[PDB]
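PROTOCOL LOG
Step 1. Enter all chains and additional molecules of the complex.
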Amino acid sequence: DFANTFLP
Amino acid sequence: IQRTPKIQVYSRHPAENGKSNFLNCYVSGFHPSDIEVDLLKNGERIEKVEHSDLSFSKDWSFYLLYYTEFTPTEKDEYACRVNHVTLSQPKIVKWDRDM
Amino acid sequence: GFHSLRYFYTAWSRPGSGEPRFVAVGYVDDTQFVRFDSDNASPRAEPRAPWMDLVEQQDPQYWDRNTRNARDAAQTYRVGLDNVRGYYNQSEAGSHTIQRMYGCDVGPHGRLLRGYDQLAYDGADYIALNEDLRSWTAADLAAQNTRRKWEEAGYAERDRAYLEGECVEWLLKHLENGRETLLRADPPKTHITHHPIVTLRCWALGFYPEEITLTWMELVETRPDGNGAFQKWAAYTCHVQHEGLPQPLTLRW
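Step 2. Run joint prediction.
Step 3. Record the structure below.
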Protein backbone atom coordinates (compact mmCIF):
# COMPACT_ATOMS: atom_id res chain seq x y z
CA ASP A 1 0.00 0.00 0.00
CA PHE A 2 0.79 3.67 -0.38
CA ALA A 3 1.71 5.44 2.87
CA ASN A 4 -0.20 8.31 4.45
CA THR A 5 0.09 11.71 2.77
CA PHE A 6 0.70 14.83 4.87
CA LEU A 7 -0.12 18.34 3.70
CA PRO A 8 3.00 20.61 3.48
CA ILE B 1 16.05 24.27 -10.49
CA GLN B 2 16.05 23.66 -14.23
CA ARG B 3 17.83 20.76 -15.92
CA THR B 4 18.04 19.98 -19.62
CA PRO B 5 17.16 16.45 -20.79
CA LYS B 6 19.70 13.82 -21.72
CA ILE B 7 18.52 11.89 -24.80
CA GLN B 8 19.24 8.39 -26.07
CA VAL B 9 17.46 6.93 -29.12
CA TYR B 10 17.80 3.20 -29.66
CA SER B 11 16.02 -0.06 -30.42
CA ARG B 12 15.02 -2.69 -27.88
CA HIS B 13 16.79 -5.43 -29.89
CA PRO B 14 19.66 -5.15 -32.39
CA ALA B 15 18.00 -3.90 -35.54
CA GLU B 16 17.52 -6.37 -38.38
CA ASN B 17 15.71 -4.98 -41.38
CA GLY B 18 12.32 -6.53 -41.95
CA LYS B 19 12.03 -7.83 -38.37
CA SER B 20 9.69 -6.29 -35.81
CA ASN B 21 11.29 -4.18 -33.09
CA PHE B 22 10.71 -1.28 -30.69
CA LEU B 23 12.03 2.25 -31.20
CA ASN B 24 12.91 3.85 -27.85
CA CYS B 25 13.67 7.44 -26.87
CA TYR B 26 14.88 7.69 -23.26
CA VAL B 27 14.87 11.22 -21.80
CA SER B 28 16.39 11.65 -18.36
CA GLY B 29 17.99 14.09 -15.97
CA PHE B 30 15.49 16.91 -16.63
CA HIS B 31 13.43 19.32 -14.56
CA PRO B 32 10.64 20.43 -14.59
CA SER B 33 8.59 17.45 -15.74
CA ASP B 34 6.65 18.92 -18.68
CA ILE B 35 8.40 17.75 -21.83
CA GLU B 36 7.42 17.18 -25.46
CA VAL B 37 8.83 14.05 -27.07
CA ASP B 38 8.02 13.01 -30.64
CA LEU B 39 9.38 10.08 -32.59
CA LEU B 40 9.94 10.98 -36.25
CA LYS B 41 9.82 8.79 -39.36
CA ASN B 42 11.45 10.51 -42.34
CA GLY B 43 10.83 13.75 -40.43
CA GLU B 44 7.11 13.07 -39.80
CA ARG B 45 5.40 12.47 -36.46
CA ILE B 46 4.57 8.92 -35.56
CA GLU B 47 1.09 8.62 -34.15
CA LYS B 48 0.09 6.73 -31.01
CA VAL B 49 3.58 6.84 -29.47
CA GLU B 50 3.40 5.67 -25.87
CA HIS B 51 5.49 6.51 -22.83
CA SER B 52 6.43 5.14 -19.42
CA ASP B 53 5.02 6.54 -16.17
CA LEU B 54 6.75 9.67 -14.85
CA SER B 55 9.43 8.85 -12.27
CA PHE B 56 12.57 10.48 -10.97
CA SER B 57 16.06 9.82 -9.66
CA LYS B 58 17.49 10.46 -6.20
CA ASP B 59 18.68 13.93 -7.41
CA TRP B 60 14.96 14.70 -8.14
CA SER B 61 15.49 14.77 -11.94
CA PHE B 62 12.84 13.11 -14.08
CA TYR B 63 13.09 10.25 -16.56
CA LEU B 64 10.68 8.87 -19.20
CA LEU B 65 10.85 6.24 -21.94
CA TYR B 66 8.95 6.93 -25.17
CA TYR B 67 8.47 3.99 -27.49
CA THR B 68 6.65 2.49 -30.46
CA GLU B 69 6.73 -0.75 -32.41
CA PHE B 70 8.46 -0.47 -35.76
CA THR B 71 10.08 -2.57 -38.46
CA PRO B 72 13.46 -1.11 -39.50
CA THR B 73 14.32 -0.80 -43.17
CA GLU B 74 17.53 0.11 -44.96
CA LYS B 75 16.32 3.57 -46.03
CA ASP B 76 13.79 4.81 -43.45
CA GLU B 77 15.16 7.45 -41.08
CA TYR B 78 13.95 7.65 -37.49
CA ALA B 79 14.63 10.34 -34.93
CA CYS B 80 13.47 11.68 -31.59
CA ARG B 81 12.50 15.36 -31.26
CA VAL B 82 12.59 16.76 -27.72
CA ASN B 83 11.39 20.14 -26.54
CA HIS B 84 11.69 21.47 -23.02
CA VAL B 85 11.78 24.85 -21.33
CA THR B 86 15.59 24.56 -21.06
CA LEU B 87 15.89 24.22 -24.86
CA SER B 88 15.97 27.37 -26.97
CA GLN B 89 14.94 25.20 -29.95
CA PRO B 90 13.75 21.57 -30.22
CA LYS B 91 16.54 18.99 -30.14
CA ILE B 92 16.57 16.20 -32.72
CA VAL B 93 18.61 13.03 -32.17
CA LYS B 94 18.77 10.60 -35.09
CA TRP B 95 18.38 6.88 -34.56
CA ASP B 96 21.66 5.20 -35.34
CA ARG B 97 21.58 1.42 -35.73
CA ASP B 98 24.94 0.92 -34.01
CA MET B 99 24.54 3.82 -31.52
CA GLY C 1 22.72 -6.58 0.58
CA PHE C 2 19.01 -5.80 0.55
CA HIS C 3 15.78 -5.06 -1.22
CA SER C 4 13.71 -1.91 -1.25
CA LEU C 5 10.12 -0.77 -1.66
CA ARG C 6 10.13 2.76 -3.04
CA TYR C 7 7.38 5.22 -3.96
CA PHE C 8 7.67 8.40 -6.03
CA TYR C 9 5.07 11.18 -6.15
CA THR C 10 5.13 14.23 -8.42
CA ALA C 11 2.54 17.03 -8.12
CA TRP C 12 2.73 20.13 -10.25
CA SER C 13 0.60 23.15 -10.92
CA ARG C 14 -0.38 24.23 -14.42
CA PRO C 15 -1.88 27.74 -14.07
CA GLY C 16 -4.44 28.32 -16.81
CA SER C 17 -4.64 24.59 -17.58
CA GLY C 18 -6.90 23.31 -14.85
CA GLU C 19 -6.08 21.67 -11.57
CA PRO C 20 -2.59 20.48 -10.63
CA ARG C 21 -1.59 17.04 -11.89
CA PHE C 22 -0.49 14.23 -9.58
CA VAL C 23 1.43 11.10 -10.64
CA ALA C 24 2.48 8.29 -8.29
CA VAL C 25 4.59 5.24 -9.07
CA GLY C 26 5.88 2.39 -6.94
CA TYR C 27 8.94 0.20 -7.40
CA VAL C 28 10.44 -2.88 -5.83
CA ASP C 29 14.16 -2.56 -6.52
CA ASP C 30 14.43 -1.74 -10.25
CA THR C 31 10.90 -2.98 -11.20
CA GLN C 32 7.95 -0.61 -11.38
CA PHE C 33 4.77 -2.33 -10.16
CA VAL C 34 2.00 0.30 -9.63
CA ARG C 35 0.99 3.69 -11.06
CA PHE C 36 -1.65 6.37 -10.53
CA ASP C 37 -2.24 9.42 -12.74
CA SER C 38 -4.79 12.05 -11.74
CA ASP C 39 -5.33 13.17 -15.35
CA ASN C 40 -7.06 9.89 -16.22
CA ALA C 41 -10.84 10.00 -16.21
CA SER C 42 -12.04 8.32 -12.97
CA PRO C 43 -8.37 7.62 -12.19
CA ARG C 44 -7.42 4.36 -10.48
CA ALA C 45 -4.29 2.79 -9.18
CA GLU C 46 -3.22 0.30 -11.83
CA PRO C 47 -0.82 -2.67 -11.98
CA ARG C 48 2.43 -2.40 -13.93
CA ALA C 49 4.19 -5.73 -13.15
CA PRO C 50 2.89 -9.28 -13.67
CA TRP C 51 2.30 -10.32 -10.05
CA MET C 52 0.08 -7.28 -9.49
CA ASP C 53 -2.38 -8.82 -11.95
CA LEU C 54 -2.94 -11.46 -9.25
CA VAL C 55 -2.93 -9.36 -6.06
CA GLU C 56 -6.74 -9.09 -6.27
CA GLN C 57 -6.98 -12.84 -5.52
CA GLN C 58 -5.51 -12.60 -2.04
CA ASP C 59 -6.38 -8.93 -1.50
CA PRO C 60 -9.66 -8.09 -3.23
CA GLN C 61 -9.71 -4.56 -1.81
CA TYR C 62 -6.13 -3.66 -2.88
CA TRP C 63 -7.11 -1.54 -5.86
CA ASP C 64 -10.02 0.25 -4.17
CA ARG C 65 -7.92 0.98 -1.07
CA ASN C 66 -4.96 2.38 -2.95
CA THR C 67 -7.13 4.27 -5.47
CA ARG C 68 -8.84 6.00 -2.53
CA ASN C 69 -5.48 6.83 -0.95
CA ALA C 70 -4.06 8.20 -4.22
CA ARG C 71 -7.14 10.29 -5.07
CA ASP C 72 -6.95 11.77 -1.57
CA ALA C 73 -3.20 12.39 -1.95
CA ALA C 74 -3.79 14.22 -5.22
CA GLN C 75 -6.27 16.57 -3.53
CA THR C 76 -3.93 17.11 -0.58
CA TYR C 77 -0.94 18.02 -2.76
CA ARG C 78 -3.14 20.41 -4.78
CA VAL C 79 -3.60 22.41 -1.61
CA GLY C 80 0.02 21.71 -0.71
CA LEU C 81 1.15 23.48 -3.87
CA ASP C 82 -0.85 26.52 -2.83
CA ASN C 83 0.56 26.44 0.71
CA VAL C 84 4.20 26.17 -0.37
CA ARG C 85 3.75 28.87 -3.03
CA GLY C 86 2.56 31.07 -0.18
CA TYR C 87 5.48 30.19 2.12
CA TYR C 88 7.87 31.36 -0.64
CA ASN C 89 5.75 34.46 -1.45
CA GLN C 90 5.37 33.30 -5.05
CA SER C 91 2.81 34.44 -7.56
CA GLU C 92 -0.09 32.32 -8.75
CA ALA C 93 1.13 32.69 -12.36
CA GLY C 94 3.98 30.17 -12.39
CA SER C 95 4.09 26.38 -12.44
CA HIS C 96 5.75 24.72 -9.45
CA THR C 97 6.50 21.12 -8.51
CA ILE C 98 6.31 19.09 -5.28
CA GLN C 99 8.03 15.71 -5.29
CA ARG C 100 8.01 13.03 -2.60
CA MET C 101 10.05 9.86 -2.30
CA TYR C 102 9.56 7.40 0.54
CA GLY C 103 10.22 3.77 1.23
CA CYS C 104 12.23 1.16 3.07
CA ASP C 105 15.52 -0.71 2.61
CA VAL C 106 15.36 -4.22 4.07
CA GLY C 107 18.18 -6.71 4.52
CA PRO C 108 18.24 -10.48 4.76
CA HIS C 109 15.87 -11.77 7.48
CA GLY C 110 13.36 -8.94 6.95
CA ARG C 111 14.74 -6.25 9.25
CA LEU C 112 14.32 -2.56 8.44
CA LEU C 113 17.74 -1.11 7.63
CA ARG C 114 16.62 2.41 6.70
CA GLY C 115 13.29 4.19 6.34
CA TYR C 116 12.93 7.49 4.50
CA ASP C 117 10.38 10.14 3.45
CA GLN C 118 11.84 13.09 1.54
CA LEU C 119 10.15 16.00 -0.24
CA ALA C 120 11.41 18.47 -2.83
CA TYR C 121 10.06 21.78 -4.12
CA ASP C 122 11.00 22.93 -7.64
CA GLY C 123 13.72 20.30 -7.88
CA ALA C 124 15.49 21.04 -4.58
CA ASP C 125 15.33 19.55 -1.09
CA TYR C 126 12.40 20.87 0.94
CA ILE C 127 11.87 18.65 4.02
CA ALA C 128 12.91 15.15 5.08
CA LEU C 129 12.15 12.63 7.81
CA ASN C 130 15.24 12.12 9.96
CA GLU C 131 16.82 8.66 10.02
CA ASP C 132 15.40 7.99 13.51
CA LEU C 133 11.91 8.43 11.99
CA ARG C 134 10.91 10.72 14.91
CA SER C 135 11.46 14.28 13.67
CA TRP C 136 11.94 16.32 10.50
CA THR C 137 14.68 18.46 8.92
CA ALA C 138 13.63 21.52 6.92
CA ALA C 139 16.05 22.36 4.13
CA ASP C 140 15.49 26.13 4.24
CA LEU C 141 13.54 28.77 6.12
CA ALA C 142 10.32 28.46 4.09
CA ALA C 143 10.15 24.74 4.79
CA GLN C 144 10.12 25.43 8.55
CA ASN C 145 6.41 26.27 8.03
CA THR C 146 5.89 22.62 7.16
CA ARG C 147 8.26 21.30 9.79
CA ARG C 148 6.42 23.16 12.56
CA LYS C 149 3.06 21.87 11.28
CA TRP C 150 4.23 18.27 11.00
CA GLU C 151 6.03 18.26 14.35
CA GLU C 152 2.96 19.53 16.20
CA ALA C 153 0.66 17.15 14.32
CA GLY C 154 2.78 14.12 15.22
CA TYR C 155 3.10 12.91 11.64
CA ALA C 156 6.54 11.37 12.19
CA GLU C 157 4.84 8.76 14.37
CA ARG C 158 2.46 7.84 11.53
CA ASP C 159 5.35 7.63 9.05
CA ARG C 160 7.35 5.55 11.53
CA ALA C 161 4.49 3.08 11.87
CA TYR C 162 4.23 2.69 8.11
CA LEU C 163 7.95 2.41 7.46
CA GLU C 164 8.62 -0.09 10.27
CA GLY C 165 5.47 -2.10 9.66
CA GLU C 166 3.46 -1.94 6.43
CA CYS C 167 6.40 -1.00 4.21
CA VAL C 168 8.48 -3.99 5.33
CA GLU C 169 5.50 -6.33 5.19
CA TRP C 170 4.49 -5.27 1.71
CA LEU C 171 8.07 -5.51 0.47
CA LEU C 172 8.16 -9.15 1.63
CA LYS C 173 4.76 -9.88 0.07
CA HIS C 174 5.79 -8.38 -3.27
CA LEU C 175 9.16 -10.15 -3.29
CA GLU C 176 7.53 -13.56 -2.91
CA ASN C 177 4.47 -12.94 -5.08
CA GLY C 178 6.72 -11.32 -7.69
CA ARG C 179 9.63 -13.79 -7.32
CA GLU C 180 10.00 -14.65 -10.98
CA THR C 181 10.27 -10.96 -11.86
CA LEU C 182 12.06 -9.56 -8.82
CA LEU C 183 14.38 -12.30 -7.61
CA ARG C 184 15.82 -13.06 -11.04
CA ALA C 185 19.41 -12.06 -11.77
CA ASP C 186 19.46 -12.03 -15.58
CA PRO C 187 22.97 -11.63 -17.00
CA PRO C 188 23.76 -9.33 -19.91
CA LYS C 189 23.87 -10.70 -23.42
CA THR C 190 27.28 -9.43 -24.51
CA HIS C 191 29.06 -8.85 -27.82
CA ILE C 192 31.46 -6.46 -29.56
CA THR C 193 30.70 -4.55 -32.77
CA HIS C 194 33.18 -3.03 -35.17
CA HIS C 195 32.88 0.25 -37.14
CA PRO C 196 35.87 1.72 -39.05
CA ILE C 197 36.34 5.48 -39.26
CA VAL C 198 38.04 2.21 -35.95
CA THR C 199 35.36 2.13 -33.22
CA LEU C 200 34.98 -0.91 -30.99
CA ARG C 201 31.71 -1.00 -29.04
CA CYS C 202 31.06 -3.44 -26.19
CA TRP C 203 27.33 -4.09 -25.71
CA ALA C 204 25.45 -5.37 -22.65
CA LEU C 205 21.77 -6.12 -23.33
CA GLY C 206 18.72 -7.45 -21.49
CA PHE C 207 20.21 -7.55 -17.99
CA TYR C 208 18.53 -7.18 -14.60
CA PRO C 209 19.12 -5.61 -12.03
CA GLU C 210 20.29 -2.28 -13.40
CA GLU C 211 23.69 -2.30 -11.68
CA ILE C 212 26.50 -3.22 -14.08
CA THR C 213 30.18 -2.46 -14.65
CA LEU C 214 31.47 -2.02 -18.22
CA THR C 215 35.17 -1.46 -18.77
CA TRP C 216 37.63 -1.50 -21.67
CA MET C 217 36.24 5.78 -23.92
CA GLU C 218 32.55 6.61 -24.25
CA LEU C 219 30.28 4.97 -21.66
CA VAL C 220 26.57 5.67 -22.15
CA GLU C 221 24.17 5.86 -19.24
CA THR C 222 22.35 2.62 -18.47
CA ARG C 223 18.96 2.72 -20.21
CA PRO C 224 15.73 0.69 -20.01
CA ASP C 225 14.96 -1.65 -22.82
CA GLY C 226 11.21 -1.25 -22.43
CA ASN C 227 10.67 -4.92 -21.53
CA GLY C 228 11.68 -4.73 -17.89
CA ALA C 229 15.46 -4.95 -18.39
CA PHE C 230 18.43 -2.68 -19.16
CA GLN C 231 21.14 -1.91 -21.74
CA LYS C 232 24.57 -0.29 -21.72
CA TRP C 233 27.53 0.02 -24.06
CA ALA C 234 31.12 1.25 -23.96
CA ALA C 235 33.07 2.34 -27.06
CA TYR C 236 41.84 -4.57 -26.40
CA THR C 237 39.45 -6.41 -24.09
CA CYS C 238 36.09 -5.49 -22.59
CA HIS C 239 35.21 -6.74 -19.11
CA VAL C 240 31.69 -7.01 -17.68
CA GLN C 241 30.69 -7.30 -14.02
CA HIS C 242 27.03 -8.07 -13.30
CA GLU C 243 25.22 -9.78 -10.43
CA GLY C 244 23.91 -12.41 -12.88
CA LEU C 245 27.38 -13.42 -14.04
CA PRO C 246 29.08 -16.11 -11.90
CA GLN C 247 32.42 -14.48 -12.80
CA PRO C 248 33.40 -11.29 -14.66
CA LEU C 249 33.35 -11.94 -18.41
CA THR C 250 36.11 -10.97 -20.84
CA LEU C 251 35.44 -10.28 -24.52
CA ARG C 252 37.59 -9.35 -27.50
CA TRP C 253 36.95 -8.74 -31.21
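Step 4. Note key features.
Residues 109 and 150 of chain C are 32 Å apart (CA to CA).
The domain at 185-251 of chain C is CATH 2.60.40.10 (Immunoglobulin-like).
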